[PDB]
Amino acid sequence: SNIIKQLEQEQMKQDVPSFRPGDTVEVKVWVVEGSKKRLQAFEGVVIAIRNRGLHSAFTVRKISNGEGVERVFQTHSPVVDSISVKRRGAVRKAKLYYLRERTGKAARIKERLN
Amino acid sequence: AVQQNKPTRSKRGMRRSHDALTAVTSLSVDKTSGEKHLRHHITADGYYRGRKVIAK
Amino acid sequence: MRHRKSGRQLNRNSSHRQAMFRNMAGSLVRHEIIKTTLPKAKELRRVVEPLITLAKTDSVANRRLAFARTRDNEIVAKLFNELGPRFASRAGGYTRILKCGFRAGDNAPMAYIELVDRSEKAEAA
Amino acid sequence: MIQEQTMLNVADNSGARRVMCIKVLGGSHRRYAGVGDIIKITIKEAIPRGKVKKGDVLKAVVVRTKKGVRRPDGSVIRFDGNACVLLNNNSEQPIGTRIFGPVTRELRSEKFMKIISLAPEVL
Amino acid sequence: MIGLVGKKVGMTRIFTEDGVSIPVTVIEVEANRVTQVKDLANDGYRAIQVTTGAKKANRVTKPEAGHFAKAGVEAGRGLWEFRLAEGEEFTVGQSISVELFADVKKVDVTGTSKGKGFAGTVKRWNFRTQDATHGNSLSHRVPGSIGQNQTPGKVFKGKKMAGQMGNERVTVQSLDVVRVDAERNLLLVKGAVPGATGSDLIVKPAVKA
RNA sequence: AGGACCGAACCGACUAAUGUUGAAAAAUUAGCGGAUGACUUGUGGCUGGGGGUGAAAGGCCAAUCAAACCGGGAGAUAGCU
RNA sequence: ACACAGGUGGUCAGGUAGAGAAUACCAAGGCGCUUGAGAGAACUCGGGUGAAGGAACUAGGCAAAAUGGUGCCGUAACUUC
RNA sequence: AAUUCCUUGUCGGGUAAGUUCCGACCUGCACGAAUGGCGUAAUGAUGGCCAGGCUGUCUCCACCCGAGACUCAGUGAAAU
RNA sequence: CGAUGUCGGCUCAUCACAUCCUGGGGCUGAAGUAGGUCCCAAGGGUAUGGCUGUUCGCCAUUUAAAGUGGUACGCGAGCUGGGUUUAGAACGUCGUGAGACAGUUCGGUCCCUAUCUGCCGUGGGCGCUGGAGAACUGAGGGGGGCUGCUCCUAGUACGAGAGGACCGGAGUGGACGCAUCACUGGUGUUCGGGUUGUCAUGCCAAUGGCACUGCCCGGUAGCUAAAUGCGGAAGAGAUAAGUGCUGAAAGCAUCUAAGCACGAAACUUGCCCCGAGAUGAGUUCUCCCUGACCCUUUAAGGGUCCUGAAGGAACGUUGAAGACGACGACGUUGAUAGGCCGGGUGUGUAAGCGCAGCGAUGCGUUGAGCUAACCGGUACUAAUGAACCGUGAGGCUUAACCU
Ligand SMILES: Nc1nc2[nH]cnc2c(=O)[nH]1
Ligand SMILES: [Mg+2]
Ligand SMILES: [Mg+2]
Ligand SMILES: [Mg+2]
Ligand SMILES: [Mg+2]
Ligand SMILES: [Mg+2]
Ligand SMILES: [Mg+2]
Ligand SMILES: [Mg+2]
Ligand SMILES: [Mg+2]
Ligand SMILES: [Mg+2]
Ligand SMILES: [Mg+2]
Ligand SMILES: [Mg+2]
Ligand SMILES: [Mg+2]
Ligand SMILES: [Mg+2]
Ligand SMILES: [Mg+2]
Ligand SMILES: [Mg+2]
Ligand SMILES: [Mg+2]
Ligand SMILES: [Mg+2]
Ligand SMILES: [Mg+2]
Ligand SMILES: [Mg+2]
Ligand SMILES: [Mg+2]
Ligand SMILES: [Mg+2]
Ligand SMILES: [Mg+2]
Ligand SMILES: [Mg+2]
Ligand SMILES: [Mg+2]
Ligand SMILES: [Mg+2]
Ligand SMILES: [Mg+2]
Ligand SMILES: [Mg+2]
Ligand SMILES: [Mg+2]
Ligand SMILES: [Mg+2]
Ligand SMILES: [Mg+2]
Ligand SMILES: [Mg+2]
Ligand SMILES: [Mg+2]
Ligand SMILES: [Mg+2]
Ligand SMILES: [Mg+2]
Ligand SMILES: [Mg+2]
Ligand SMILES: [Mg+2]
Ligand SMILES: [Mg+2]
Ligand SMILES: [Mg+2]
Ligand SMILES: [Mg+2]
Ligand SMILES: [Mg+2]
Ligand SMILES: [Mg+2]
Ligand SMILES: [Mg+2]
Ligand SMILES: [Mg+2]
Ligand SMILES: [Mg+2]
Ligand SMILES: [Mg+2]
């Protein structure tokens, strides 16, 4: 516990920016592209956050080619290179699972602006 | 399902070989009231570990 | 299995337990000593002591919160006027269980549970 | 996580639109196929003048599933539905000539290199 | 090679430079103190007996205390033996730390598995359930037939039936050693090991490859 | 208007689980059909055993009806056990 | 046969919501059903939620799940209209 | 065929695959005209077959809430 | 025949071997790849569906394979009830008829609280020779034992070509098994929120009860699989069929008579679990007990007074231990449980007040308030000073040391 807490926080990123459910987020991820290693962008809406120290995670949801793609990131993974908020969204819930039944015009999210 | 044969009085007694009660071995005497009582329980006049803890 | 779980089921369903401890928690606050089965007395601490803790800070919201958990304005009034101040500086453990007999009618193990610094005047009034 | 009776959309221009999985290939009593796995399918709907027809029996590789794929740091990539790419029964090479929607790098096989090149997006 | 005694702390993960997440059981391994050396002449076999931990004086019986006093070590929470190899040698009162595993690639880990109480055949033996509907009467998780007929006219020993599950010794083999650190009393192994947080573990270098 | 439609009471009894030394010698729960009609129901009456009654199932006729129940012939007879 | 979840004709008809004598919550009134206390195993009964799949179950979609209101738009073969 | 033994007849349709189903043939073991023949809209807690939706029916079972089961106290059976 | 329930399915199996796959081998009309046939081999493994009550069978698609048989054609006091022996009804056929069919068709009650054996678990007792606490030894028992594909060797050997290996090594999967909850998720009627009808708390505002947790959206701990770790082995011994060496009987030959070398997933080990009631009750370390008397049938005798240890148990607070027992932790020289403090987590900006708006409502105070089983702390509450069991130096014989 202390031992574990101590093992876990020496592995934790220090500069995770603040973001919240409904925000539009761009995550830059390290990938091996054939024989290259590059950053690849993945942009979408944060529909779920799991706050849990080192095991923190978050689910980003986007539309590719008419169909939805959801990516669960482990926030502290070295695979995740950076996170940046592209727009601040206004929602009430913590978990936006209802957006999965919505498409295009129905799935929009107002801007927070404050 | 029921017996094909009548069990014996011997068998009945074996079955019961674990039925005996245990006498309480842990009575104490309250040092103020002089009453007997189960350990860690109050006495009938409401004393415990020497203090009158319950008026009744 | 039951690993690491709290809460006694008491051969009741969830809404009955809650009404019951709501009544029983008022009984203890009003009379300052009651007798009940040992297991109910032990569950009860977990309901009455957070009420007393709450009452250590007098505010409309804390009164209403306590009202919602007791639905009896005599009890919330005593919590905040008398019991909060009695226990102002006691870090928990506002109640005490005294084990006593076995109930005649069904042999249930019984106990008294009382407010620690008990007022016999309050008890009779 | 595809099994017998499962229905899949189709991520190519083979002309198929809806296919049913009638066998998970690759082992006795094998239960599920996932991204990268080959299935046997029957075609339940196809367009009018495509490369295949309703009722044709063939193979396909799964390229998107709802159950998703795990990556090595613990991550998950999930898709809103199950899709596959039709494969010749014998050569197990793609019937279609184009691929639609995103695919995953789990396909990077000698065998499925053509599918990732054609894919609009690779995750 | 000898093994060591430890405590299961819990699981967590190590992230690697290139994106792998290794799940690790955290095992606490304090110095093991040697409380008796057994040899051929005196015992018929070769072994060390060790303790680790600390124990409450008022809980140390006199027999126990004489045994510890004899070795010149303070009481520990228990005693465990590890067989010796030819050339393996130790001395009473010697301290053995977790650095013993510094260059051991894999270890076997023994623990007492969590207790699931009285378990039915579905959970204990993966039996399959009979029909939930289709007229089934009172027989969904029940076991089915437990035998044949007149021949043999009996149920066979070993028959898989319901009963106590877990709370037993279980050894999980060939777990990778992910980290050893004596200054913190730590050993990290890859994967899950038996037992609940808190319970004792025996760690030995892997008997296999 | 209607042996009309949906649907409570009321009448019935298609399915399933439970129960089967039952809560019950035929039920209970969830569903089901009829519900202005060849409907349903109270009180009283009439039909009697080779007889009644039967939109007919040998159905019903006081908790077992291809011949009710009680008493009698009666200790029928029993080359069977 | 029981202080038995059964059977038993008529009368009365409060408030809110509601088409309603359905249904939910209440009033007047009546009750908590005459063994209780703990525990929180298998298994049984009765329920709630369920990843991916969706009849692959089975004699059979048995059981579940689902549908479910009002208003308006709209509605095929066939037909004794 | 509520009728067909041979019989899962044969041919066609549906299914990836259909001893059932639908359509057709006629070789009707053993249909047929008030012992009514052949049709027939509507009706049907009627029999067979198909599809959409739906789902713990199933792959394959998990967790949970309650009544028993288990323990204590009182009463206290049964078949054999 | 004063009753031994029938086909098929489901669940659960267990044995044989005349072996389906995998393993070893002889012959081949065996070039290789792939086959055929016989011998050895029972360690493990040995398909889902369409039709039909089907078993079977045909068919579709898998697989290394989809084995053959015994077990009351295994298995209804374990389930089903589709087939098939009741009563209803109809068709064909037969019969004057009642009726009949071993023809077909629609419909059609499956009871039993386990005494004994057996089996799965779990305790109590006594024993093991004074008693006690641990740690062991390991006789015996159980578990496990499956296999695809790809790559290197090598486009090599072989082959006209097409194709395409043995031996050996690497990797990655299918099914199966155990463990675990860190991750991904399910659940989470004990957490937070939204909301419909109604009733109450005097009313506003705020709340609470009931309606499946009223209906829902999320979700902590725990439990858990679909989640993610790990496993089957290598090695060794002795072998099977089989291959040989040396070698006479039998001047030669001959694997065999003497002698000698090999040889498989079977056997014995090696791996995992139980295990000294292993009454053949074993070993090691440690701990504890150092008073008298009486009586008879005088003996391993019976009793009395005084003693009462080590330990065990009891009581209490309890546990990721548990039906009960058991097992683990703790009992003030104290974190055992509850509370309490701080944190995390979940929910998602409480109440009150102020501002804006005619109002619904919005905004600010405010990531607010609330927050279970969680983490880190804390003696506030409860874990009593003490009594119960267990004794008081432990038999005879012989040997070896020592007196
Ligand atoms: N009260 C009490 N405390 C203890 N601490 C250790 N053992 C005991 C015991 O038996 N009783
Ligand atoms: Mg009870
Ligand atoms: Mg309720
Ligand atoms: Mg609450
Ligand atoms: Mg040990
Ligand atoms: Mg347990
Ligand atoms: Mg099944
Ligand atoms: Mg029944
Ligand atoms: Mg049932
Ligand atoms: Mg039987
Ligand atoms: Mg016998
Ligand atoms: Mg009508
Ligand atoms: Mg009904
Ligand atoms: Mg009607
Ligand atoms: Mg009458
Ligand atoms: Mg006469
Ligand atoms: Mg007579
Ligand atoms: Mg009564
Ligand atoms: Mg009554
Ligand atoms: Mg009503
Ligand atoms: Mg589901
Ligand atoms: Mg879903
Ligand atoms: Mg669907
Ligand atoms: Mg089917
Ligand atoms: Mg089937
Ligand atoms: Mg139904
Ligand atoms: Mg329903
Ligand atoms: Mg079908
Ligand atoms: Mg036809
Ligand atoms: Mg009708
Ligand atoms: Mg329960
Ligand atoms: Mg009793
Ligand atoms: Mg008999
Ligand atoms: Mg053989
Ligand atoms: Mg031959
Ligand atoms: Mg076998
Ligand atoms: Mg084959
Ligand atoms: Mg049979
Ligand atoms: Mg039965
Ligand atoms: Mg027949
Ligand atoms: Mg030995
Ligand atoms: Mg209001
Ligand atoms: Mg042992
Ligand atoms: Mg606000
Ligand atoms: Mg807090
Ligand atoms: Mg003496």
Coordinates of N, CA and C (backbone and C1' of nucleotides) and ligand atoms in Angstrom, one line a residue, chain I residues 83-85 102-104, ligand 40:
Chain I
rG83 P -44.5 -37.6 -28.9 O5' -43.6 -38.7 -29.4 C5' -43.1 -38.7 -30.7 C4' -42.4 -40.0 -31.0 C3' -43.2 -41.3 -30.7 O3' -44.0 -41.7 -31.7 C1' -41.0 -41.4 -29.7
rU84 P -45.5 -42.2 -31.3 O5' -45.3 -43.4 -30.3 C5' -44.9 -44.7 -30.7 C4' -44.6 -45.6 -29.6 C3' -45.7 -45.8 -28.7 O3' -46.6 -46.8 -29.1 C1' -43.8 -45.2 -27.4
rU85 P -48.1 -46.5 -29.4 O5' -48.8 -46.9 -28.1 C5' -48.2 -47.7 -27.1 C4' -49.2 -48.0 -26.0 C3' -49.4 -46.9 -25.0 O3' -50.7 -46.3 -25.2 C1' -49.4 -49.1 -23.9
rA102 P -51.0 -51.1 -33.9 O5' -49.4 -51.4 -34.0 C5' -48.6 -50.8 -35.0 C4' -48.1 -51.8 -36.0 C3' -49.2 -52.6 -36.7 O3' -48.9 -53.0 -38.0 C1' -47.7 -54.1 -35.6
rG103 P -48.7 -51.8 -39.1 O5' -49.6 -50.7 -38.5 C5' -49.0 -49.4 -38.1 C4' -49.2 -48.5 -39.3 C3' -49.2 -47.0 -38.9 O3' -47.9 -46.5 -38.8 C1' -51.0 -47.4 -40.3
rU104 C1' -51.4 -42.3 -39.9 C3' -49.3 -41.5 -39.1 C4' -49.1 -42.6 -40.0 O3' -48.3 -40.5 -39.1 C5' -48.1 -43.7 -39.5 O5' -48.4 -44.1 -38.2 P -47.6 -45.4 -37.6
Ligands
MG40 MG -46.4 -47.2 -33.5

